[model samples]
Target: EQAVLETFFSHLGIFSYDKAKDNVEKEREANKSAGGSWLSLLAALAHLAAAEKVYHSLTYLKDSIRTIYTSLHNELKKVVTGLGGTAPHVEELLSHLSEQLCFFVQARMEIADFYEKMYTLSTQKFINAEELVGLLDAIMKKYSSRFHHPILSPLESSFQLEVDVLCHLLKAQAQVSEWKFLPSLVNLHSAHTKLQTWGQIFPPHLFLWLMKLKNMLLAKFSFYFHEALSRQTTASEMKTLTAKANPDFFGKISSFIRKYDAANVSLIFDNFQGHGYHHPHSYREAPKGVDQYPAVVSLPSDRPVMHWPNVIMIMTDRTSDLNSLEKVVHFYDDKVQSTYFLTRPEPHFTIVIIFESKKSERDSHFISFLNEVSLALKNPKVFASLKP
Candidate 1:
């Protein structure tokens, strides 16, 4: 019996070592991207492994319970400061409290699962009824400490009763020689009761999180559905725009325009602007050519410089087809003579829209898109006067 137990424990020790190694490797990979310490990962894995072993071994269960109690007490103490204080939202406060309770319940169930698995394995292999009873007694006493005196909360008392039933089953098994008799009956009954009680006391907040997760999934599905519809409509709009342009010039215009509108082009020409004064050295040729005055001469330094009127032209190609009309606009920074091409029947051009901004900052896409259309349509020259 002793040899069998030693071999079983040895196997568990080997398993823990392998598990720890795998955990360490995974943690290292995760931390490489996250910039977290390897030591913190190792420490957390060590604690989890130790806790699992302690939960299974009755001799170590008492110490494990004490450690857990201390840790939980400290955590609860920290939370107590925020409870019933000047916290912002009442629902959030209640949710936090409910989550804490859920955490406690989950921790207990995990330890219970570990304990039950080890007990079943030990019973099947070793067949030591007396030692099992002693172990059960130790576990029961540790669990019952919650209900003993100072910390007698309703939740703790309920948990303690469940632990007591488990201990009782162990005692019954120890007393009976036959596994087919009262011993097995008692154990089965206790196991069934424990499962039922766990179901009854399960966390409501866990269910809430599950519901919230379901809603989020639905929201994501709806978002994708709308996005697909929008993309299809946008593609159709682009097709209509292409049909309006002269077929011969369409390729040439599109090639240049697409390159200009490409994401990288914005990054490259961010600082380039057409409106700016020429340097003094650029005007030296004008002064040399003119005795009275050149065709265009440099102004005197004393004279106030005339501010050139800034002009922006936006031109769009329109189809000659009577039924189908598509206009695509190109924005030019300054005024220039430009020619546009057309195919099919003679293209009929009309000034469809215009706008002007008192403040240059208000000319941004966001402001124009959100504001009233009447305000945007006030300035015809802004959209109409372009040659192409």
Candidate 2:
């Protein structure tokens, strides 16, 4: 995943945008000796098209491309107009070219920005599910409004459908982060359906990327759904279960969590309704009269630990029994973890374990745990238990 993207980003000349921007004016002067500014601009546009394959589902290199193209476009228009209206046909051709290129660059910029912002928001040290949704709503609305542009009606119609799929995909991702499995499933289903239809006309590169996302989401939905049904339930309650349970689900989740070692851990089952476990002892056995345990949450520092049911949250700034933590660590100094769980209570649970580490360097154990966790989630059976 990492290597391929780097190669493509470099291959498509992602850095060439800057070079062209600086030389566009120079190329205009060089027009007499060599090729004109238009030729150089065309090469950059070609690179942009190639770079679009990187993640047309999430492409971003448009603004600079648009600026340089537009600058050249306007300057060329000036030259044609200054010719005393002698070449009206040539002027018309240049106008159409500008319109086409500008629209394409804007579309790519919007999609790319959406993907980038989502990544940034998800990685924040602390954030609530609702906050994530709120910020995303504005971004989606802006993208949706782009569909109304008059010029776009004659362009490719699939941009609207592409936005539709992305909106659902984003919603599904947000829902999963909060453990809302049912809603996430609904969104994923919608995204998958739209993606299939959109694939008919989507560029080959985009179709492939979207398909990968679709498959991963479907697999995740399947795993969470079956795991929820696997929990021990009475025959009366089992009647509510719509699908047959995968009997091995519980053992897999238990084994998945038991094998990982971390300084603080919390597994919330049934979205806090069913029984689960936590670590560091403070959460496992609360003090007398303490109804809620201070449990770790996904949010950043405004609120480090919150009182929640059946979870363990260690305060990084304060003193604690977490022996491996660095003395220089602060609440905002940052932490890392490997998380696998269903936050929404449709039927699955939430599993997250975090440990404090040096802000500049990731703990070796934490990095290995992340890799293993990613592999385990990808395929439960493929992950060998670390405990043994």
Candidate 3:
């Protein structure tokens, strides 16, 4: 009870809203009945009644910021949806949204300042035996119904749960190894649920951050999933790596690899984005010396970046007695022959070559590979280069 009392003031704030104010009321009433007798009792924690007006006054601007931002954010989603079909509309809407969003961004910093002020005051609140501690606990306890989520506005309450969830998930991600949580719907169902339940709550920036994180995890998961296909990984071991980010993902990865003896052209096929079977092409293995079929895919915007389409990946069923081919990655020639191409090994002699995105050309050191593709793709020989 004493700890709870100390904690309450520690959490006291403008955003603490009515919770802390509730305690202030009782304390004021008690002070009136008891007088300076209680004030000397243990710092008495006095003068809250005088500040009551001040605390309530702080709500007006904060509420305005929340209300305006929330309404604007909500309206813009529909705006973008309707405008998405037309490039001009998208441009106009995006420009307008950025202008309004700039205002919210500035407001957010101001609100952050107020939040910290409350936080700073809350934590420094007097604490000791024989004082407002017990009474404080009694007052703060009334807010359990909704996690005492700050009533900063209609906004925070709706999305605070998601932000809170992301923090914990983020902490876990930080603490664990890269493969520990393989971001997937099955693994991140709680996160997915929060998004589903409060999809409307997120402002554009926060929503984009979450989406970016989600895709990052998915990309890394696909990378690991590809690794798992050829490697000897036990179910228990696999579960440890994939359980949180995705439970059913490993099973699906292996099932597809086994059923068709081929790898999908893209990860989003099994990854599931609203619907499935988006990437129809499968990079099938070729029969050795039987005319190598090109496994070319022109990815519009490589999930993480944009890339040019060309004959890239070659997944062949035939494993040769010959040595494994050192795949020629277009951007890695300067590094070494081994680093040039990216080759994935499976159960047999066969290897899979997944193309790196056009974005990858400038990402790292590989002048040799870059020299080849940059020249080939941009060459006048292929098509007359537009000389400036």
Candidate 4:
């Protein structure tokens, strides 16, 4: 697992760092001449910001993993109690710690590689604050799972190593005025929602701990951004600078920021709602039908219906309604059957669909008809017939 985790982080971190370095080189070329090519400068700055974000993110992840490992090591020592002599359990704990440490070392090496790439690209020059933060964020996403996962679980380790590391990093980052790191920190906070959902199975204590850590991270990020902006140059100065540059440059920067904001929003939403297969509801919305129809069909009483209105009828053009209904039935049947266990006990007594359509008028009436049919199916009388 550590190897798998390291592999993911290494690949992601290197890619992001390399891209960031390339952007910096582009910016350098643009600035070589007087006044600089504003377009190139903006592009370079955008990439730089992304790079910093990813770097900070990766660093936090690496630190979190190390902290957890160290904390677990100390905790395990206590668990061994008076058993000073080397034992099998002690050996196992030590092995776990060693593996964790190895993972952290490898992660750190990847981070060093990122910095090395950045340095080489800049000819040893420093990357700007925002760019650094972006790189950090990209890296963080690569390894942030370690901080909240198996490490935080009671079964894994009782000590909150990830949180301890994060708090320390936050304080140090604040003291050093690393404001650019805030964005990635905020992104990490957003990513913690997955662990929050695991609260259903995990102990409440773990959930509370995660919540506190998340709040602390978010608060720190907000404070950093607020404080940094407060000390920034006046709006007029910024406007003047913007005016000096080509409009297209500003547009590009704005677009880049917009995309960044969108990505952050998406991350936050997914985190809270649960991501991937963890989410109970499907993210995909129902597709629009080619046409609408107003006919509704009621199945015969003798039909082997499993329950009241277990089926829905959608109307389509008579010319092609049969074909369309057949496709729709297959699609709907597959989805519903796979999702529910109603048909498990009595496979033959499953939902049956009845299709209705009107030639030429089908397209205009489908949506409204479906809604009406849905309501009708809920009526007790409609369902009562299934019993007979």
Candidate 5:
């Protein structure tokens, strides 16, 4: 059963929104061979709802849960054929699950409203730290009480953990806004510890989301920590502080790139120094079928330099309409340039691997291998090993 959950979660992540939607569809048709009881499926759905509510909107999440409810209702109807006394039990369970799903949907709506209020309070002309804190307390209260509900009790640990993390972060952000440096760092530290403690237990999407928050806090800590040091130090002490913050910043990013399996890869992200490396070659020829449709020639050169950050932004931005997730360029020298947007171990940072091929289909197997590497980067454990 854990394997079943693992199989499902193993494919869910930042790049796998489409895949997650597909899973919701497939699970509707799942049967006995799916190898999980109703309780397990419900728990998974709860976790999915929690994550989708964070990453996406409540609208789609409801549609997903409704689909599952419909399927379960159909299954219950089918069980009536036996009427083996089994039908009543299944009927009871399905009814309870249906009721719980309704409660869960309403719960998410309230949660959304709570967060929206918090957002509204933050933007007010008169700053109200106390009100912000009160709102966060209310959120905590709401989410915490869900644990005690008879129908939804023990929904999924991730939901509670996520709320707890958000509270810590909200407080930390408030503290940072008020220039309470030490206290802010303390709150951020608490958040980091909570994430580390429960890190591997989360689904990939939540894990990535949590890790991204962790990275953001780390960046903040580095920034504010240095600013504090500069305020009280002389140039002599400041020199050391500069060195301290410098290594502290670069060291994490460098160590981040080191955790990958680097065997037999033609090109890594390190090959390009900056955006300059993507300068158009003088002998550059147009890609195939371009001559037949010459309108593309009037546009900006097809060979735009795909920066690491630019690619990550495109892939992770769920609202982005840019479909150029990966690009291929053929040079006049008979060499093929394939640039793939690789997965991020953290939120703001990621890697892009470019490959050179002779000309076409032979690289399909290798591309799949790259796909494995991409998946490897998204693993919670792989991300957990990262220092940030």
Candidate 6:
């Protein structure tokens, strides 16, 4: 089924969080203490929780939090416990460990209290909502940008926000039915109300955040797309949207989606670059025959200089060499722009080819490239052959 495909903050781990925990248990024995203060212990736990929420929604919370806790304790023993020395001091730490551990889960941001709070905030209209939202956006961005934040971030700054707000964004989980519907969307204006369920992803709660109060969301895009693809009744919706579109809108966008396959289009995130020039790896194989293929009027980036809200492309073949990329690009720019003055792609790589649904109408070149890309979907020859 044609779906509203997209990507989110995006991973590998060498030592399993389990092995690390086992090692930590060895340090926590009768001879010694676990070694972290209520402060450092919570510091590690909270940051780990943020990392989980922002980047690895697919991973389990307990696994991440558990692993982080053990590592911090192990380090404390080495760094502060005198490489496992100071027995009397260690003994004192041990005796107090169990007492402090009592509040571990209770004090944890990702634990029990978190859910009741997320359920409350996500379902309620907040007082200082924007400040709360800005923080989440900042973290998700950094998560997408960083490669290794074993402890997520320093959390030194977050020690600033209202304590409740800080924890909710960084630790709230969304994998279960608890986040299924929302109070906000319970009252969506019809335009956004019925944008098609899409599947397990687009139910209201997780998504209504994509509507009006939210800016640049996948759900609203989801709505627009559904409207564009559907018959979308005397809906006053702009169907052709011609004045709002560029020439190759249909051919370019369809081909771009097929090219990137945003359906399978996932992000390594740079921990989000061209999301690696195309898809798989946004990564190309270092081009055996070439490299440094530039194109501006003269040189283009190996990567599309921008992220596509949507990408519009022309009736052209995908090429490995800069020469061919240039020719097709030349013609593409020609078809859509003001000749030789074809400045670089601006913010550079995407264009929204069509603004509205064309339904079933088209030009000859349009009919042709549509079939062209559609064919290669089967054989794999076109994408692989290079100059072949």
Q: In lDDT terms, which candidate is top?
A: 5
Give the candidate number with the greatest TM-score: 2
lDDT of 3 by residue, 45-122 (tens): 223322223322433333433343343343333333321134444234343333333333333433433333433343
lDDT of 1: 0.32
Better of 2 and 4 by TM-score: 2
Ranked by TM-score from best down, the candidates are 2, 5, 3, 1, 6, 4
Model 6 misplacement above 4 A = 1-16, 27-116, 122-131, 135-220, 227-388
Can you write out model 6's per-residue Cα lDDT over 58-104, one digit (the tens) per residue?
Answer: 22334434444444444234332323334546344433433332233
C-alpha displacement of 102 in model 4, angstroms?
A: 1.9
* Alpha carbon lDDT of each predicted model: 0.32, 0.41, 0.33, 0.32, 0.42, 0.28
Ranking by lDDT: 5, 2, 3, 1, 4, 6
Candidate 1 backbone collisions, by pair:
315-388
Query: Once all C-alphas are superposed, what RMSD does model 1 give against the true structure?
Result: 32.3
Q: Candidate 4 — which residues are off by over 4 angstroms?
A: 1-87, 123-135, 145-388
The superposed Cα distance between candidate 3 and the true structure at residue 128, in angstroms, equals 37
- Please give the TM-score that candidate 3 achieves against the real structure: 0.26
RMSD per prediction, one decimal? 32.3, 14.4, 23.3, 25.4, 19.7, 21.7
lDDT of 6: 0.28
For model 3, the local distance difference test gives 0.33
Q: Which stretches of candidate 1 lie over 4 Å from their true place?
A: 1-73, 80-124, 145-158, 172-388
- Give candidate 2's TM-score: 0.44
**How would you encode candidate 1's per-residue C-alpha lDDT over 1-388 as one tens digit per residue?**
1221122223323224455545544655533454232234244434544544444343432334545533443333343233123443632343334333433444464445445444335311123446756655655454434323322244444445545444544454343322123334455456446535543443222223322322222222222122233345674464444344322222332343354321110000000101122344554332231122111111112111221111111221222221132222223222332211111111221221111212223334422322222122122221122111
Off by over 4 Å in 2: 1-104, 118-156, 200-212, 227-371, 374-388
